[model samples]
Target: ALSPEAITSAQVFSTQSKETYTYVRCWYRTGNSHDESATDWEWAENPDGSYFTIDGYWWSSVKNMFYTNTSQNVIKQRCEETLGVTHDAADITYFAADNRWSYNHTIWTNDPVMQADQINKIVAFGDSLSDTGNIFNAAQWRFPNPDTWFLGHFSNGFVWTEYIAQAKKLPLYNWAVGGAAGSNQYVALTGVKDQVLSYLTYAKMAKNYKPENTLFTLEFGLNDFMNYNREVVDVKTDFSTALIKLTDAGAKNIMLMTLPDATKAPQFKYSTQAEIEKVRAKIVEFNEFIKAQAAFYIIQGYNITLYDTHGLFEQLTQNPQQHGFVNASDACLNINRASSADYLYSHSLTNECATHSSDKYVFWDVTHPTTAVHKYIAEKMLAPGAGMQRFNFHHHH
Candidate 1:
C-alpha cells in the first residue's frame, strides 16, 4: 500500500510534462503488473501518454520500464529536469483512476486566503450581482418586493458577497446598489464611484479601521454595458478612479470581477443577433481592461485578485445539470411583469416566476442569479486552486 506521502510524490512526478519522461526508459514501463498483492493500486493507462500504476509500482508502457520508490532524489532529478515551473508542489494531486496528474496552473502562492483571520472585513462595491441590500433598502424596502424577492437582495436569495462573508464568518459592508454602473452619468446617481466615496468619507475615518486587513471587492460594468453601451475607455476611467481612491486610502487588498455576458440572460433573448454581439464585444473589452488594471495595481504593491465571474457564469450556463440548474438560459422570475427593477413580481408570485423552484434556474430575474448560483460563485472564489487567477509579478526592490 502506498502511503499518502508516496502518492503525493507520484503525483508530483506525474505532474511534470510528458515530454520530460514520455520517452525516457527509467520510469516508464509496459505490461501489466496487476496482482492481488496491490491493495489501493489499480490497473489503468494514461489517456494521452504512457504512465500507469500497477501492483504498487508506477509503470510506463512507452519504454517497458517500472520505477520503484528507491530514493527521494530520484524524483528530485526527474522533476528538476521538468522544473520549468515554480510552486511545483503547492496544489498538485493524483487521481488513481485517471492514471494522470492534474493541477491548477492559476493557483498563486502569496494570495491564498482560506481563513477568516486573513481577511478582517469585506468592503464590496458593485451593481446587482453584489448588492446585498443597498438598492432594496435605498428604495425604502419598497422594492425587491418582499413577495418574490428575498429581503433586499436583487436575487431570489443572498448574493455572492453575503455568502462569502457568511462562509468566512467575516463582517461585510456591502455598498453595492442595483442598477449602478461605473459612472453616475450612465446609471443615475448610484455609480460605484459614489459607493467608494461614501466608504472613504465615513469608514475611512473610523479609528478601528484597518485598510491592511480589509479586502475591498469591486464588480461593476454590467449596467454600464447593458444600459448605455458605454465605451471601454470611459468605463475603465471610472473604474480606475475608484481603484485609485481606495488604493490612495491605504487599501492593501483588493479583488475585482469580470462582467458576465448579458446575452445569456432571458432579457436579451428577444434582441437581434447583431445587437447581442455589440454588447458581447463590449463585455470582452471591459473584462480585459479589468484584468490589465488589476495587474497594474499588483505591480504597485497592492494584493489583488481578478475573480473569474465571467468564466463561472459560462460554466454554470453551459453545464447546467452539473450545477443542479434545469434552466440557465431563462430568468426564474419573468421580466415582462415588472414596471421597475424593484418589483420582481406582482402580488401573485406563483404565476410570475418561471417555476416554483428558483434554485433550479440560474438567473433569478432578468439580471440577477438565484441563491444557488450565488452560493456556487462564493464557493468558486473560495475554492483552492480554482477561481483566483495566477499572475506573474517581479519585485525590483
Candidate 2:
C-alpha cells in the first residue's frame, strides 16, 4: 500500500533502444519491501567489438552468468584497449523517466487517429453517482454491467459519460466505481488505479487507443460533501492535490466538477431546508476553492478547466416545481411510497417531471442529472467565450 506521493517516486523504465545503453528494469515480488530487493542488472554489445556493464541484480541465473565479473571486466577492458573509447562513467548515458514524458507519452497519448482536436480519451474518476453500472438484486449487489444498465429492459438513454460523449461527439472510457469519493481517488479501492492505468496502457495494445488527445472529466464531490463531519476541508485539499498530480502527469486538459445539492434528495427527505442550505453553502465553498486552484494553473500556463454543477443546481432551484418538480422535495424517481408518489406514473407524468424534458429539470434522481440536463450543461461547456463569462467551462487557447 503506497501513498499517492510514494507511488509517484517509484522506479520506472524505458525500452526505446538496445545497443550501447544502460537500462534498469523494476519488478516487484510479493514479499520484497526494500529498493535493493527489487533491482535488476543487464548488458549489451557496442559497435566497436566492446561492451558495457549495467550494474544491478539479475532476476534469472542466465542473466547473472552473462554478466559475470570475467565477462564484465573483459568487455570493459576490451572497449578501452581495442577501441579508443574510455569507459568514463560520466559519459555513460543515464536515462530517467521525466515527468513531462510520463505526462505526454504514458498518461496521455496524442495520436491523430484517436481524435486529436476533440478529446478521444476520457477517464471518469469518481464514486457512486458515476457507478450506476453497479447492479443490485434481492440477493447481492454485483457489477455485472460496466457498459450498460436495464431499468425496463431498455437503454436508459444516457449515463453521465455517455451523454457528455454524445454531446461532445467523442468516445468515453468510464473509470468510475460505486461508493468512491474525492478523498479516495487512487487505486487502493479495489485496485482502481489499475483500471485507469489499463485504460492508458491500452493505447499501445489497440490501434484506437490514443493518449495525447484525451480529455479527462473528473466528477466526485457528493460523497465528500456528505461525509463532511469527518474533516471536509482536509478531504477537499486531498482531492485538489490528486488533481494537481494528474495535471503534472500530462493530463493536458481536465474538468473538475462540483457536487450537486444532495440534501434535497428523497433519501434525505427528513432533512430540514435550513440544513440543506447549509450543506449547499459548504459545497459552494469547496467549488470556490476549485475555481481558485484552476485560476492558479491558468496563471502558470496550464490548460485545465472546472465545471460548476453546483451553480447549475442553484439556477434550477429558482424555478423548481415549474418543471413537474416538488420545489423543495427530491426528484420523482426517488419517492418509494406508492401513496405519496404521484410522479411515478411515467406515462402521464412525463410532461410534468424534469426526467421527461431534461432541459427543464435539474435533477433526474436524488443525486444525478437526466440526459437532457447533461446535454444542456454540455452545450454550455461547448460554447465559445462561455468560459470567460462563467466560473465553469473557462477555457483558454
- Considering every candidate listed, which one attains the maximal lDDT? 1
- lDDT tens readout by residue for model 1, 224-297: 78866778888888899889878877887787888988778777776789989999999998899899998898
Relative to the unseen true structure, what is the C-alpha lDDT of residue 2 in candidate 2, on a scale of 0 to 100?
Answer: 28
TM-score per prediction, in order, is 0.63, 0.53
Off by over 4 Å in 2: 1-118, 132-156, 180-211, 227-230, 272-278, 321-328, 334-361, 388-397
- Give the least accurate 10-residue stretch of model 1, judged by summed lDDT: 29-38
lDDT of 2 by residue, 96-174 (tens): 1222221101112223342434454456766555542321111021222111212210112244555565445443545
lDDT of 2 at 247: 66
TM-score of 1: 0.63
Clashes of each: 4, 8
